[PDB]
Amino acid sequence: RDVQPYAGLTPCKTSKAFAKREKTELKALEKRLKKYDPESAPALALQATMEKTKTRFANYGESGLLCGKDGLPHLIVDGNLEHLGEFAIPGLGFLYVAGWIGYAGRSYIQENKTASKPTEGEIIIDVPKALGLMFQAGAWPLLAGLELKNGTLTAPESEITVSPR
Amino acid sequence: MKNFQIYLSTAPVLAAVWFTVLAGILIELNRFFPDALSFPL
Amino acid sequence: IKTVKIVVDRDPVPTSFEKWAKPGHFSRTLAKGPATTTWVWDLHADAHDFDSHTTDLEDISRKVFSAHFGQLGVIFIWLSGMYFHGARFSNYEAWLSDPTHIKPSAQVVWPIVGQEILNGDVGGGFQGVQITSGFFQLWRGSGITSELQLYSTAIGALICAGLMFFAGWWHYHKAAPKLEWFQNVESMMNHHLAGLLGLGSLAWAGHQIHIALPVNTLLDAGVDPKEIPLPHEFMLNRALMAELYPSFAKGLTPFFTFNWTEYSDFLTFRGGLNPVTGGLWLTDMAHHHLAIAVLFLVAGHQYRTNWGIGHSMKEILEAHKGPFTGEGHKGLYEILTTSWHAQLAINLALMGSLSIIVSHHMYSMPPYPYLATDYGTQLSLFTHHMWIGGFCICGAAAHAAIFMVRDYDPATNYNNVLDRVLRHRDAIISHLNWVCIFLGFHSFGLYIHNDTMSALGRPQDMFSDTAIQLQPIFAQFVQHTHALAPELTAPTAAGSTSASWGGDIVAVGGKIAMMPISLGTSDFMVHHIHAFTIHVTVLILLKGVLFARSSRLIPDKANLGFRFPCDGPGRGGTCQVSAWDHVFLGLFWMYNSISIVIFHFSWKMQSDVWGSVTGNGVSHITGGNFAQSANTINGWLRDFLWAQSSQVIQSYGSALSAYGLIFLGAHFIWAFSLMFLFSGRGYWQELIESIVWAHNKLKVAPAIQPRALSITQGRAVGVAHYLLGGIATTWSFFLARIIAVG
Amino acid sequence: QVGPPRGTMVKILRPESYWFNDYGKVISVDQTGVRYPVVVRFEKVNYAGVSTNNYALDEVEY
Amino acid sequence: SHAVKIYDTCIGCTQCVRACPTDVLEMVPWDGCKAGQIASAPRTEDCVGCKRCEAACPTDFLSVRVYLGSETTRSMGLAY
Amino acid sequence: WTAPKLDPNTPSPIFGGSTGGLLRKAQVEEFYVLTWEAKKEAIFEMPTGGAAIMRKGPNLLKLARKEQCLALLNTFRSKMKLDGCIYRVFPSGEVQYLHPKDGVYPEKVNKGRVGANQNMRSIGKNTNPAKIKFQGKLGPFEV
Amino acid sequence: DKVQIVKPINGDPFIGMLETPVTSSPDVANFLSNLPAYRTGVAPLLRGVEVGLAHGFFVTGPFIKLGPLRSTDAAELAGCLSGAGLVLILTACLSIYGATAFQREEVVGLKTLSGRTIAKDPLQSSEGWASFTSGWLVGGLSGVAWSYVLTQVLPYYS
Numbered sequence A: 001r002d003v004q005p006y007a008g009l010t011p012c013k014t015s016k017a018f019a020k021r022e023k024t025e026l027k028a029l030e031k032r033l034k035k036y037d038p039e040s041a042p043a044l045a046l047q048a049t050m051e052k053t054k055t056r057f058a059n060y061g062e063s064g065l066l067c068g069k070d071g072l073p074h075l076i077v078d079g080n081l082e083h084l085g086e087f088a089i090p091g092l093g094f095l096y097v098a099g100w101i102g103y104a105g106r107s108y109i110q111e112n113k114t115a116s117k118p119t120e121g122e123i124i125i126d127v128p129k130a131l132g133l134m135f136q137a138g139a140w141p142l143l144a145g146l147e148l149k150n151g152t153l154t155a156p157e158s159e160i161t162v163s164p165r
Numbered sequence B: 001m002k003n004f005q006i007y008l009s010t011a012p013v014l015a016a017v018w019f020t021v022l023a024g025i026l027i028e029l030n031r032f033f034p035d036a037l038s039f040p041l
Numbered sequence C: 001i002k003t004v005k006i007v008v009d010r011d012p013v014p015t016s017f018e019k020w021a022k023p024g025h026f027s028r029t030l031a032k033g034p035a036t037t038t039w040v041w042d043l044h045a046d047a048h049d050f051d052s053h054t055t056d057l058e059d060i061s062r063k064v065f066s067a068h069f070g071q072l073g074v075i076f077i078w079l080s081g082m083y084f085h086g087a088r089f090s091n092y093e094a095w096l097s098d099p100t101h102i103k104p105s106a107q108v109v110w111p112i113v114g115q116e117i118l119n120g121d122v123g124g125g126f127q128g129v130q131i132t133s134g135f136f137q138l139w140r141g142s143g144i145t146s147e148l149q150l151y152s153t154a155i156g157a158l159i160c161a162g163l164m165f166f167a168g169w170w171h172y173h174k175a176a177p178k179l180e181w182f183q184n185v186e187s188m189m190n191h192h193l194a195g196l197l198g199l200g201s202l203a204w205a206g207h208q209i210h211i212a213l214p215v216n217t218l219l220d221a222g223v224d225p226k227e228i229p230l231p232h233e234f235m236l237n238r239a240l241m242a243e244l245y246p247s248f249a250k251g252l253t254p255f256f257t258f259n260w261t262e263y264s265d266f267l268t269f270r271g272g273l274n275p276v277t278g279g280l281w282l283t284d285m286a287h288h289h290l291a292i293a294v295l296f297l298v299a300g301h302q303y304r305t306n307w308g309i310g311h312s313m314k315e316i317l318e319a320h321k322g323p324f325t326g327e328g329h330k331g332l333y334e335i336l337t338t339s340w341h342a343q344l345a346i347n348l349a350l351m352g353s354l355s356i357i358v359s360h361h362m363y364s365m366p367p368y369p370y371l372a373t374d375y376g377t378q379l380s381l382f383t384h385h386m387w388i389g390g391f392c393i394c395g396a397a398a399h400a401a402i403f404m405v406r407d408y409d410p411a412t413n414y415n416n417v418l419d420r421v422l423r424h425r426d427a428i429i430s431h432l433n434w435v436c437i438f439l440g441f442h443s444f445g446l447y448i449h450n451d452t453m454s455a456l457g458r459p460q461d462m463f464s465d466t467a468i469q470l471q472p473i474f475a476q477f478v479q480h481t482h483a484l485a486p487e488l489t490a491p492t493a494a495g496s497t498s499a500s501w502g503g504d505i506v507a508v509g510g511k512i513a514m515m516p517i518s519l520g521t522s523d524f525m526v527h528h529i530h531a532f533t534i535h536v537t538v539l540i541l542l543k544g545v546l547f548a549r550s551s552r553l554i555p556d557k558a559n560l561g562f563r564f565p566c567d568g569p570g571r572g573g574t575c576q577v578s579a580w581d582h583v584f585l586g587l588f589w590m591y592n593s594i595s596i597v598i599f600h601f602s603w604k605m606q607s608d609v610w611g612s613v614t615g616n617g618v619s620h621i622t623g624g625n626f627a628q629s630a631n632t633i634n635g636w637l638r639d640f641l642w643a644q645s646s647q648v649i650q651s652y653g654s655a656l657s658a659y660g661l662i663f664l665g666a667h668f669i670w671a672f673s674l675m676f677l678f679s680g681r682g683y684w685q686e687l688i689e690s691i692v693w694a695h696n697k698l699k700v701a702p703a704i705q706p707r708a709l710s711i712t713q714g715r716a717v718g719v720a721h722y723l724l725g726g727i728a729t730t731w732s733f734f735l736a737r738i739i740a741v742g
Numbered sequence D: 001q002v003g004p005p006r007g008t009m010v011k012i013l014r015p016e017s018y019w020f021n022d023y024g025k026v027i028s029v030d031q032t033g034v035r036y037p038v039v040v041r042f043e044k045v046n047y048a049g050v051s052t053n054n055y056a057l058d059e060v061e062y
Numbered sequence E: 001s002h003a004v005k006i007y008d009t010c011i012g013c014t015q016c017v018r019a020c021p022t023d024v025l026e027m028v029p030w031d032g033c034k035a036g037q038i039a040s041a042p043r044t045e046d047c048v049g050c051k052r053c054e055a056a057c058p059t060d061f062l063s064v065r066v067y068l069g070s071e072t073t074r075s076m077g078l079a080y
Numbered sequence F: 001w002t003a004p005k006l007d008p009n010t011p012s013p014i015f016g017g018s019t020g021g022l023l024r025k026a027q028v029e030e031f032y033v034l035t036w037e038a039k040k041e042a043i044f045e046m047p048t049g050g051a052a053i054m055r056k057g058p059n060l061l062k063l064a065r066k067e068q069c070l071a072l073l074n075t076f077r078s079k080m081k082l083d084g085c086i087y088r089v090f091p092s093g094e095v096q097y098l099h100p101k102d103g104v105y106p107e108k109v110n111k112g113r114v115g116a117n118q119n120m121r122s123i124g125k126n127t128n129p130a131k132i133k134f135q136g137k138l139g140p141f142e143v
Numbered sequence G: 001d002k003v004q005i006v007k008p009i010n011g012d013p014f015i016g017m018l019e020t021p022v023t024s025s026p027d028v029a030n031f032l033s034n035l036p037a038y039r040t041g042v043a044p045l046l047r048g049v050e051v052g053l054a055h056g057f058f059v060t061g062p063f064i065k066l067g068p069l070r071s072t073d074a075a076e077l078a079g080c081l082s083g084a085g086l087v088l089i090l091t092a093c094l095s096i097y098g099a100t101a102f103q104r105e106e107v108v109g110l111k112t113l114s115g116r117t118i119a120k121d122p123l124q125s126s127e128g129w130a131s132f133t134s135g136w137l138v139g140g141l142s143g144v145a146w147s148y149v150l151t152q153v154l155p156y157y158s
């Protein structure tokens, strides 16, 4: 895709410095290659590395990246629609995954707190129940919203131990 | 046998297995979808 | 006089996973369960504290024996891995044909995240991580010419590891020996001299003679490894072996008639280095191992076991007493036959000193073909064995202190050689501290005065070679006597033990295998620095051991334990009083000293030994700047740290980029250790209280209560990360530098 | 008999207590007019590792 | 010297007294606790400040407290 | 316990000497004497360092600190189940009965002891240091 | 018959010292006892005289042979003036030590190892240490001057 220049950053696809970066790396690869005869396995490995570099640079060109004066891609994280894949979408993926991990943990700690000996189950994890809670934590945002609305997400002030101050 | 399974269910062994598997999946994703600076669109 | 015999309890413990399912079974406080997060660290800390688990010494001895079996199984796994990688993941066969120009490499990385760049151009139509363990040189010196031989011994090593584990299981669960078995030290020495060292050295001498010697002779002559006859064709075909070395045409007749002079072609005393490979003469090494075998076989018949001939070590201890030492060595036999920690202290001290000597003797007298020429493996081996030695010595101090707190009994040590040491520990520590101060003041002012004079523009007032001659006259004398040893005091030696003493610089393929080492004023100053740093480490460790049970500050310290954080802020403050804390500081200084030893080694070798002869004199790596710059701290900062760091910091984009990343990471780990070192538990516990409040707010409060690390554990983590970061920084620096410069 | 019966959960009101604002089972209450008669047992240990201590009648709530 | 104070939460378990390495603490009769005895610190001048009493006190919060103050020879624990 | 036990010239334990003994502080300031009755001859550990043999019957031992004397006496009581008393000796030549300071070990409640340094309140009921500001007070603990 | 050499100080095994061939050997004891510091019956001034002479004599030598002007012809004069300056500093140190050190009674006496009661050293007093300091000053300056003379006079000096 063709992205508009933003914050004084030209698109990497049409950036001469991006082409120079690609060129330089590829030439370095060639130099590394030259000492190896083509039949030997390092020669093929280096040619595959060159291919990988070319397709990486091409993919970065097409992915609507903005490059700077240095010639390397720069991320726009202000929320711009043209660069949402830089931070927003992977940000949403992280927020979903991290909240899943945390909610699986919270659910297991609350469930194990009802056991006869909670601290032993804290180190010897009940794998079937654990996995059940882990897969139930797929709908973490919903269940967290329910806990927030019902007031059971947060313990009241009086129950929590505090310093004498 | 069952006790050994319980031993496996211990925190260190389970952490090692879980992070071994996780590193495996992440490495496989970086092999089949390599060099991903950003989510494409 | 108990008879030495084999004693065993049959099936003492059943083989079952019930204890695996229950963490902390070995203890009583840890067995009940985790109340707080301190329990995890307590579990791991006393995992191998067998004395604190069971009171009886029999069970402890069985646990130690089978744990040793498990360690040996682990070591055999590691050896199997190294040989297997040298077979399927290396260029050993290519390196065999061109050892001078092909970089050894036995690790290849998977091409996943761009890490394939670490597969450097090591030569031979191969890419991988260049290795510095010297394993290729070892295999070449052992006569290995094919990857199948490496694979075969790797599989053997894996089988042996399985056998070692099976032996540990057998000797804990099936055939655990009784306590009276382990206490047969006479028999132990008889076997571990005659049978472990004696027969082991004999076996290796036989290998060297029959396998390594012909194969390496053919390699020296220029024969292709793929054309060399196989080792069994030399060991069995006597005509084939006699073709290379004509003494084998006489069989064993000269051996059994004391006509051993006929074996002089393959059992030599040449001394020096092989001019083609740059390693010790393999005939010399074979003769060496033969004589070592004989000496140990004879020395292993010293002690009486079951027949009246021999020595009793108790008697020869007790008979050594004198006017200054009271009862002398009486009671030490009881110490060292009823305390594992005492034996562990002695054995660790000697192992550490030995590893140090091993490093010295291997750089100076390279025992492997194309080892000296490969500067990277030589530096790596020296630095490695130095660090192992310093660590083992620190552990020796620790276990000496552990014995002193736990297993020392005043009743059995009344007026013996140990009790009198405990009765004038004040004099020992004060004199050592005085020595330590003196040494530091003199040596540091030797550097600081020089820094000051140079900065003031007064080079004539410096302690350099030009201005003030602090010449190491005694070391130069020793060098002279050793260079002249083959003429007067070692007449049958065809040459000196090392070329470092003097004359006839050894070069292999342009690069210098070995060069005579000079000793100017910078060598004097750095050696007195070494002595200073050693003496301070010894001060710390010996103070910890001697004041392990009591002091004028805390008299009741023995019952506080070997490992306690303090006795309180009273008496002005009683922090770090335990002998464990002395090992902490002792460990720190050990690290500091090694850091100077290996820096001296690296700079001196790069400047005055390593290099390349081009027919117009030596072209050293750094150009001989050590003698004129290593007399100033600025000189070490600039011409050694700053100058030689260019390889590691500019390593990005090459195969040494991993070394650069480790350099940064080890810097981080060292600074991260400073967190644990400069802080205290109270702050971290209160921060945990706030964080626990935050968790309790959301009902995420763990059942196991979060706790700050114990003060001892905080110090432990601090010293561990400090040693890790410092050593790994030096590792990355040394390896990147010496691999890039070559 | 005064104070909480045995077996009930009492909320600690002593500000300095490790288990302040926490709930603990009453083991026994001393009726001989001692200053801190209420013995309260706690699932979780303090920094000293103990799971119980004594409280007055106004330092507990049920 | 330091200051050692005994508070009425003391249960008279004697552990502070048994833990003291300088004989600063002693048990005295007292009607306030069930055990019938409270600790006291008559020989406060001998308190080195090692705080073994606080470490050995089971009551939460501590019934014995040591406050480091003016440092004398005995408090500094000097053999010289 | 009508009167404190006086200090006689009783034999000292067999010891070969050490560098951990009395310093000049014994000469200028004070030193402490530990005396105990031994049921049998046995080898004990000096708190200064080294091993000494105690004599059957009464023994006398001079040490630099009260802590050393009390540590050794606690060893004797807990291991050998002995009885001992401690004196403080000044350079002027006046001894001073120290241990147990009552004729009864402090851990055992004894009649006649008067509570010293007792605050009849919990630790949290101490006032704030701002209220005792500009007063001759050690702290909230002393009010 | 199985002689033990190292013994406790004066036979008392409960004092922080041990008598060894370095401490209680007859030759060592006679040498130390004959040094001026241990001549307690002699006037502190004259003991300070000898002390100053010995100390100021040797202390000049390091400045002569290793000072900044060691190469110049004025090496000796510089080194001797350095030695005199150091003697003056040490005189200041002695004066302040004498003012501060002897402020206590020290009620305990002193005896010899034979058990003979002896009087305290007059040197170990404020006025005695003042007299010792004056003797130190005179002796140190005389010794520095003598070192200068000998460096200018002695035949085999170089």
Ligand code: CLA
Residues within 6 Å of the ligand: A087, A090, A091, A092, A094, A095, A097, A098, A099, A101, A102, A103
């Ligand atoms: C390669 C990618 C990468 C990696 C390795 C990490 C790694 C980490 N992140 Mg980061 N992060 C990333 C990308 C990444 N992050 C991106 C792209 C974003 C933008 C969304 C974030 C935003 C982010 C935040 C906001 C936080 C982290 C935190 C953390 C740590 C714990 C995360 C976790 O799942 O714990 C397991 C998860 C839990 C125990 C549950 C805890 C709550 C989680 C973190 C969020 C759920 C709350 C909810 C959605 C509301 C969010 C409010 C927020 C917007 C302020 C860990 C070091 C946390 C941290 O260390 O801070 C102290 C943290 O608070 N990350």
Ligand code: CLA
Residues within 6 Å of the ligand: A101, A102, A103, A104, A105, A106, A108, A109, A125, A130, A131, A133, A134, C690, C691, C694, C695, C698, C700
């Ligand atoms: C049950 C999981 C869980 C949850 C939901 C939380 C939630 C929280 N923690 Mg806690 N924490 C946890 C575990 C958890 N923590 C663990 C295991 C540790 C020890 C490393 C900590 C150490 C810790 C510190 C030091 C701090 C927090 C803080 C916070 C808050 C900020 C967001 C965050 O998590 O960033 C912090 C995220 C991390 C430190 C990463 C650790 C989380 C790991 C990945 C979870 C491991 C458990 C996992 C889910 C498996 C168990 C379940 C399974 C058997 C089914 C939030 C209340 C901060 C705070 O007070 O903010 C107000 C803060 O300062 N946490």
Ligand code: CLA
Residues within 6 Å of the ligand: C013, C014, C015, C016, C017, C019, C020, C025, C026, C062, C063, C064, C066, C067, C069, C070, C071, C074, C165, C166, C167, C168, C169, C172, C173
């Ligand atoms: C599968 C076979 C098997 C089984 C079921 C048992 C079962 C038992 N053994 Mg036996 N043992 C075995 C094999 C076996 N052993 C072998 C092969 C050896 C020789 C090493 C021993 C040596 C031995 C000793 C010396 C002792 C036992 C003890 C025990 C008991 C405690 C178990 C425990 O807590 O360990 C659980 C421990 C682990 C799971 C950790 C295992 C770690 C291994 C040994 C080290 C290998 C290297 C390691 C992986 C390196 C780490 C590096 C990493 C960071 C990369 C239990 C009855 C103890 C006892 O009290 O008996 C009553 C005891 O003192 N065993």
Ligand code: CLA
Residues within 6 Å of the ligand: C064, C065, C068, C069, C072, C181, C182, C184, C185, C187, C188, C191, C192, C194, C195, C196
């Ligand atoms: C000729 C006799 C002989 C030999 C070679 C050894 C060799 C060894 N002993 Mg010793 N030992 C002997 C007799 C012998 N022992 C006797 C008589 C006793 C009883 C008094 C002991 C008691 C003893 C104890 C208590 C311990 C050892 C240990 C060790 C090992 C130390 C590690 C080392 O250096 O690795 C060298 C490594 C190798 C040589 C590699 C191969 C390893 C195998 C095990 C060598 C085989 C030796 C064995 C005696 C012969 C097989 C007999 C078997 C079939 C019954 C070493 C393998 C320690 C150890 O590590 O425990 C396992 C240990 O704790 N030994």
Ligand code: CLA
Residues within 6 Å of the ligand: C202, C203, C204, C205, C206, C207, C209, C210, C234, C235, C236, C237, C238, C241, C247, C248, C249, C250, C251, C252, C255, C263, C290
């Ligand atoms: C441990 C080290 C070691 C080993 C194993 C060997 C081994 C050998 N050497 Mg070497 N050697 C060594 C050290 C060693 N050497 C040293 C240190 C020196 C320097 C002095 C020499 C110098 C030397 C010379 C100069 C010569 C040898 C030779 C030999 C071979 C002759 C063996 C022979 O017939 O003698 C007699 C051996 C025996 C009688 C033992 C055989 C017993 C068998 C195994 C009994 C099995 C019976 C069984 C119970 C039942 C049978 C059936 C069953 C298989 C199914 C042999 C391969 C000779 C040779 O040919 O080399 C090329 C030769 O000329 N050696």
Ligand code: CLA
Residues within 6 Å of the ligand: C044, C045, C046, C047, C048, C049, C050, C344, C348, C391, C392, C393, C394, C395, C396, C398, C399, C402, C563, C580, C583, C587, C720, C724
């Ligand atoms: C022959 C060698 C030997 C043997 C048999 C022992 C055996 C023992 N030691 Mg000794 N010790 C040794 C060497 C040895 N040590 C050395 C070389 C040192 C100097 C460092 C010490 C210093 C030492 C101290 C200071 C103490 C002991 C203690 C102990 C006992 C308990 C150990 C335990 O369970 O901890 C299990 C092991 C650990 C908890 C260590 C974990 C790993 C650490 C952090 C290092 C890992 C570094 C690693 C290589 C870097 C990479 C990490 C990577 C994953 C990132 C046990 C008797 C302790 C004791 O109580 O004695 C009775 C004790 O306090 N030892």
Ligand code: CLA
Residues within 6 Å of the ligand: C433, C434, C436, C437, C438, C439, C440, C441, C442, C444, C445, C448, C536, C539, C540, C585, C586, C588, C589
């Ligand atoms: C560069 C930092 C540094 C320095 C200078 C010192 C210095 C010292 N340490 Mg420390 N130490 C350090 C870092 C350092 N340490 C660190 C980080 C650790 C880890 C915790 C330790 C751990 C430690 C322990 C555990 C021990 C020491 C000991 C010593 C002393 C050893 C004797 C010595 O060096 O001779 C004398 C001192 C020096 C040479 C220091 C430099 C002084 C120079 C030469 C200036 C000379 C005078 C100068 C002209 C000033 C006069 C004029 C001025 C007034 C203007 C000395 C006081 C040991 C000790 O005290 O026993 C002897 C000991 O036991 N240290």
Ligand code: CLA
Residues within 6 Å of the ligand: C441, C442, C443, C444, C445, C446, C448, C449, C452, C461, C462, G059, G062, G063, G066, G067, G068
């Ligand atoms: C301890 C280390 C050390 C040493 C050996 C030296 C040595 C020297 N310095 Mg350097 N210097 C040092 C540290 C040191 N310095 C440090 C850390 C600094 C601070 C930055 C300086 C700064 C400095 C400056 C600025 C200058 C020197 C100068 C000198 C020289 C003359 C000094 C002088 O007059 O001494 C006087 C010495 C003494 C009064 C006595 C020395 C000690 C005696 C000999 C001990 C003998 C004890 C004996 C063995 C005991 C016997 C007992 C028996 C009777 C029973 C000399 C070469 C000067 C120069 O230019 O000359 C080249 C100069 O200008 N130095």
Ligand SMILES: CC1=C(C/C=C(\C)CCC[C@H](C)CCC[C@H](C)CCCC(C)C)C(=O)c2ccccc2C1=O
Residues within 6 Å of the ligand: C675, C676, C677, C679, C680, C681, C684, C685, C707, C708, C709, C710, C711, C713, C714, C715
């Ligand atoms: C940082 C620090 C702490 C705080 C460190 C805390 C208590 C522990 C370190 C953190 C570990 C990593 C907690 C263990 C985490 C669990 C194992 C959870 C699983 C891990 C998931 C996140 C993957 C101390 O307690 C301390 C004490 C004494 C001197 C110095 C210090 C000190 O410097």
Ligand code: SF4
Residues within 6 Å of the ligand: E009, E010, E011, E012, E013, E014, E015, E016, E017, E038, E039, E056, E057, E058, E059, E062, E063, E064
């Ligand atoms: S103070 Fe703590 S320890 Fe001493 S008696 Fe009162 S309660 Fe028991």
Ligand code: SF4
Residues within 6 Å of the ligand: C570, E004, E019, E020, E021, E022, E023, E024, E025, E046, E047, E048, E049, E050, E051, E052, E053, E054, E066
């Ligand atoms: S501080 Fe040490 S000495 Fe003072 S009372 Fe508490 S324990 Fe006894």
